[PDB]
Design a protein around this motif. Sequence first.
Motif, mmCIF file in Angstrom:
data_model
loop_
_atom_site.group_PDB
_atom_site.id
_atom_site.type_symbol
_atom_site.label_atom_id
_atom_site.label_comp_id
_atom_site.label_asym_id
_atom_site.label_seq_id
_atom_site.Cartn_x
_atom_site.Cartn_y
_atom_site.Cartn_z
ATOM 1 N N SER C 179 45.828 8.023 -25.531
ATOM 2 C CA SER C 179 44.939 7.814 -26.701
ATOM 3 C C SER C 179 45.705 8.047 -27.999
ATOM 4 O O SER C 179 45.196 7.677 -29.053
ATOM 5 N N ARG C 295 41.464 0.630 -29.044
ATOM 6 C CA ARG C 295 41.402 0.904 -27.577
ATOM 7 C C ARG C 295 41.174 2.408 -27.332
ATOM 8 O O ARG C 295 40.441 2.772 -26.394
ATOM 9 N N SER C 296 41.807 3.270 -28.118
ATOM 10 C CA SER C 296 41.605 4.734 -28.035
ATOM 11 C C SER C 296 40.125 5.063 -28.313
ATOM 12 O O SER C 296 39.523 5.853 -27.546
ATOM 13 N N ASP C 299 38.027 3.975 -25.244
ATOM 14 C CA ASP C 299 38.133 4.948 -24.133
ATOM 15 C C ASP C 299 37.264 6.166 -24.432
ATOM 16 O O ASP C 299 36.691 6.700 -23.502
ATOM 17 N N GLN C 302 33.833 4.921 -23.520
ATOM 18 C CA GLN C 302 33.786 4.843 -22.043
ATOM 19 C C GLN C 302 33.475 6.239 -21.496
ATOM 20 O O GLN C 302 32.589 6.359 -20.619
ATOM 21 N N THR C 303 34.186 7.267 -21.982
ATOM 22 C CA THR C 303 33.929 8.673 -21.582
ATOM 23 C C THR C 303 32.492 9.086 -21.956
ATOM 24 O O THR C 303 31.759 9.608 -21.073
#
Lengths: 308, 308, 309, 309
Positions: C179, C295-296, C299, C302-303
């Motif tokens: 990340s 993208r970080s 994610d 997503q978490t």
Amino acid sequence: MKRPKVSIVGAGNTGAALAHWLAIKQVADIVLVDVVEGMPQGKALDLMQSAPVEGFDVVITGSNDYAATAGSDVVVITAGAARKPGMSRDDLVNINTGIVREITAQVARYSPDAYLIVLTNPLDVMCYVAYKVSGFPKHRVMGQSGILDSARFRTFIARELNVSFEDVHALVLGGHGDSMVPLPRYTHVGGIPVTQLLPKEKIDELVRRTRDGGAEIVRLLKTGSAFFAPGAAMAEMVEAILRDRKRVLPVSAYLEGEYGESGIFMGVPVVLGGNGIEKILEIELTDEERQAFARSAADVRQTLSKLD
Amino acid sequence: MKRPKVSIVGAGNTGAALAHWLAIKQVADIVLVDVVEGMPQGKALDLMQSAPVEGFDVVITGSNDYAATAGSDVVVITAGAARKPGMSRDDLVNINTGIVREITAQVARYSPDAYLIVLTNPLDVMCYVAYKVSGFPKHRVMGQSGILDSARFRTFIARELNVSFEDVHALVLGGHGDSMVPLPRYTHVGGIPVTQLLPKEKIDELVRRTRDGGAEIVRLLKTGSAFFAPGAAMAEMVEAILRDRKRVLPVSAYLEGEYGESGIFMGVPVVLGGNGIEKILEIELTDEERQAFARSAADVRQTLSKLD
Amino acid sequence: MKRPKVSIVGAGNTGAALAHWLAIKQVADIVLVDVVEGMPQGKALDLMQSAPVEGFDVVITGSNDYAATAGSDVVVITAGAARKPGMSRDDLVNINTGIVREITAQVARYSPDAYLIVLTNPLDVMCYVAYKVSGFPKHRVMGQSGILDSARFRTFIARELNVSFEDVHALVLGGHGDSMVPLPRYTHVGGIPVTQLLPKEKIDELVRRTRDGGAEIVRLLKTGSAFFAPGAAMAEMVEAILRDRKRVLPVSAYLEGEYGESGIFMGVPVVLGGNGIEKILEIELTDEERQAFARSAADVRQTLSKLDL
Amino acid sequence: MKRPKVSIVGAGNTGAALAHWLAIKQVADIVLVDVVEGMPQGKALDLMQSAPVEGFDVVITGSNDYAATAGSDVVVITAGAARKPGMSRDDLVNINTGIVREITAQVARYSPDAYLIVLTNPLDVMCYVAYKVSGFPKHRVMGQSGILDSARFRTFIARELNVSFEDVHALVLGGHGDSMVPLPRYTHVGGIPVTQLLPKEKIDELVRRTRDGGAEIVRLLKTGSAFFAPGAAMAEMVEAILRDRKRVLPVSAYLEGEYGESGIFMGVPVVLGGNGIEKILEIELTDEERQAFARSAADVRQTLSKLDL
């Protein structure tokens, strides 16, 4: 959440040294105030321009206007005249009385809640002037003199034995010079009473050099007086209030029975913290030490009765 | 110009805390050595990764090899066994004798000119082991014990009076616990003997808490021992040497007549500087105090007789 | 005048190291809080017993009771679990979610006006948990991550060039590992962009060491994780607030449009002062850098999508 | 173990400020030297009397005798004449050439292994005078100028943005005033190039204030020149040598090809450590910066060609 604020009245060598000592401790923003135009502005900017190199985050500004001192936590008065040859002790008292009176009225107006630390000679008397003109309660008005005398005596003891400056301690009562009450019994090297480490003859000599300490530096400099050590002595007091350290230091404190004296400032041992003078410590004195303190007290009391 | 080098043998909580205290003083490059693979390397890289944030220029490396310690100005031995449940006095002395012997032989080989500071208990006895195994002259071998007992006593006094930690001072002689010789006469707050500020009963309680101080931290942590304050006490001794401070401190020093004892280490006041133990200070003790010191000394001497 | 108060929740290696770095700065009295009886009491008393030797005037105490944290200026959360054998990725996060929620509810009750600093991994997500549970406004909640990645990168560069740790500077965006968004263009040696002093291949290898920096210490210690440098990075944030320093530091801050993201914590450059996060600075990024930051952020979402929000 | 020894020639405000900044670092015993009887003795004893209060173990002494400088690790020359109304650049060069020559001959005799740091204006020229008179190798002779210009620029930027003094960085090449080479690309705030944070007009203004910073302090004080910041800049250089920090700093260093110049001192980025000037870093310059540095070099070279040494 916001840094405290310290105003220093008098941007001379001692005022500028105090600003230097305070900047490195990262204890407050600093305002340097002086009548001379450009001088405090230049010393302030000069000192702040050291901040990126030396690591410290405090703003130092200069003014010729007491308004710049508004909302100070601590106000230090370093301003005053020195005794010129062809000038009485009473002439010094009268000139410095007018200087401290005018400064105190201005600063007490812009910072009604301030702690007030005085340096102006003669110190015990100039503290009374500040006390009465400000109208501040006794816990909020004090003077530097005992820490400087103590610092010089500790320095001379440490160099004589060749030991760490950190490990030599000394409590001194009274004022500078003849009004000073040195205490060999309250003087230690790593806990060890100095009387066990130096002969009486040498202790008496170092005591004489302490009494004459300010005069010795005046003789070497030829123009002006000490500033590094008086700056440091004041920086310790400012920091003891702002960080609530509860230091046990000799300072000029207003007495109301302590050591048998009321209605005067004397150099006495105090706890100095976030509520200013938190306690006056009454220590054991010999008959001789009590009589010296009483004599110094009597001199201060009769000087007060002559003030405008 | 090159920074001095300090090696620390034992990278447990105490060795690491010492590395931390030494790094922020910017006094030397630091090598951590331990038998446990990865542990000194990982703690050394972690501490060094704090350098850009905290602003110190010190290189900290870890090794499992005593070769990493070559050419150290100072080596500190913090390693030793915990006295485990049911383990006798004599078993601990025997385990730690072997640990101290093996470490000293190795560190003396790679740094024949080093100053050696021991922490391993029993401390006065382990100092003797390191002294004989090293072949070093007595000025280069010493133990940390008194500074830690002094620090705890000063903490307890400072909190009892609610005064600054900087203004309480105490000289303690002997070792930990029952071998400790407190000196009320050599204990002061801002130059004021603590007997003027705290009743006898309170002083006695604070002394008992100081004798029990190490066990107290043990009972609270339940696994492991104190590390912060032992760390700080050792850091003061390392800095006293590297910077030639001539600190006046209680440390375990080899006696050849001082305090009427020869052929052992005891906790005594020293001048600690750039030549290690530069002087042993002989202070006024009462009959009781001398007797308590004599008892501590005899106990040390009998332990040394049993072992080689 | 009274000294400020800092509570540290979690009296392990990192909590205690943080207490140590804070004590030498003389910036506040410190309360250490842990569930383990005796431990915070023992560490606090040991650290305070260093005070007469080391010159500092602060009181350090410890407690097993959150009531000891009442009226803190700054509360730091260092507690959290590490992944165990047989434990799933999502289970670890769920366990840290519980730990941060319980701590945050207790500390926000006892200090409703505090600044809250989170260490618990995964850091950007745990800041979001703290933020929602606390009900604190966004200037008062933040996490330590980027300073520790910056410090590691700076340490590797300084050791590579053999120069002062004081003259190597690195801005790092995002979280740890994958990340992280390192920025060689915002990495300097006495003002000299590091791309003038180190070729591409070396910079790539020092970035990789930085991404893996936490795991490196874990592999060496074998039990436990880094504590000195995380401790230092948190002390820098605590001091920035208590002395209103206006430090320009990478911290996990709540985004409301910055870098095109709204509704999450991300590691970004802030002005950190006595009113907490005073400004989030929006720096120039290449398309690739922007895509790596996006993208970080993805994610992080997503978490969060798997957490009992 | 012995503390190192620093001698300071000139016990005026700058020399005394230097001693103060050094005493606080606990880096060396200090000797102040001046021709004026009593003055260095008085300032030394005054500074050393602060030691029991400020917690430093350094001995500070004062002498009118150069022999008191024997065996110094570092000697700092702060002495020299200021430009008065009605004296040419040439008068100043010849007066200060005479002062630095007499100082250097004495201090180089008593400390033949010393590192020499020069302050005396005009700085790049006065460094060449110290280099020639001492006969010391080039790594052992250097001048303070760029650190002070950088410090003023960093101060102005920090106050303009209201950010931490710790997080503003600037490399400056060349000398004071018209000889100064500011480098906006080598100037950052928390790693962010300052051109992203301030408009070009404001940067241009803070650059003009930096070129004029020396004269600005002189206008305000009316008697005498700046002393705190010049004092701190020299303290940073002394410390870099005595603790082998390998700081990356702009200093006046002797060139033997670097930046296209030989046989002069110029303000360049160096690594300053335990062996003095350990490296000169050759940075990327725009055409305009390269041209300004070449013009200043040509000017310094021409001034050197007229001296006897």
